[PDB]
């Protein structure tokens, strides 16, 4: 075909805090490798760094990446170019309209990857708060990704290797525990795992 194809047709989500850096790097990579992927953040608001630590640029979820881009450009185009935010926002715009909050989505997934335990917990808490009415299993997996541009890309590679492995399973529910441990031993990373239900 014209594109790579996931034989398991997994529906995947990747989740971070602001749906800006880590989840979007993973979104882009996963999509290019042919996966059905969506991305979200778990924070109350979208938060990008500013010119001072105590002066973040904060927006509501739903604010178009394009508008955040314009906002920072007029603030100080050169500063937000050198620190990488304008490129990040540009990459994001090409993927989708705006940052989305996981707790507000109605989409369902076979696998949800989170990029730090705080996000993992919010995702799991949110899933548990919902009365399951289908008994459709979903696997939440946490893979720690350090929050900067370089490590976000590295995380995208690692997360993609993990999803690729699980996609090759013909019965994920009965294989996944063993596959997670194999991945942990080979890649020397801890994966947090929960099985929840829609």
């Amino acid at each position: 075909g014209s594109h790579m194809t996931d034989p398991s047709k997994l529906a995947v989500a990747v989740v971070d805090s602001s749906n800006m850096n880590r989840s979007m790097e993973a979104h882009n990579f996963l999509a290019k490798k042919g996966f059905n992927v969506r991305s979200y953040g778990t924070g109350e608001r979208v938060k990008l760094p500013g010119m001072a630590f105590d002066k973040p640029n904060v927006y509501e979820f739903g604010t178009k990446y394009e508008d955040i881009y314009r906002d920072l450009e007029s603030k100080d185009k050169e500063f937000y170019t050198q620190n990488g935010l304008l490129h990040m926002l540009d990459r994001n715009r090409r993927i989708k309209k705006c940052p989305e909050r996981f707790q507000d989505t109605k989409e369902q997934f076979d696998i949800i990857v989170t990029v730090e335990e705080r996000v993992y917990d919010l995702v799991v808490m949110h899933m548990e708060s919902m009365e399951s009415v289908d008994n459709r299993p979903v696997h939440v997996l946490n893979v720690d990704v350090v929050n900067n541009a370089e490590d976000a890309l590295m995380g995208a590679f690692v997360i993609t290797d993990m999803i690729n492995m699980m996609a090759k399973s013909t019965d994920l529910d009965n294989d996944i525990d063993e596959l997670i441990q194999e991945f942990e031993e080979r890649r020397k990373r801890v994966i947090l795992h929960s099985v929840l239900f829609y």
Binding site: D16, S17, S18, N19, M20, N21, R22, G41, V46, K47, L48, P49, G50, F53, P56, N83, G84, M88, N147, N148, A149, A152
Partner: peptide
């Protein structure tokens, strides 16, 4: 925490 982290 911001995305990315403040540098």
């Amino acid at each position: 925490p911001t995305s990315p982290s403040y540098s």
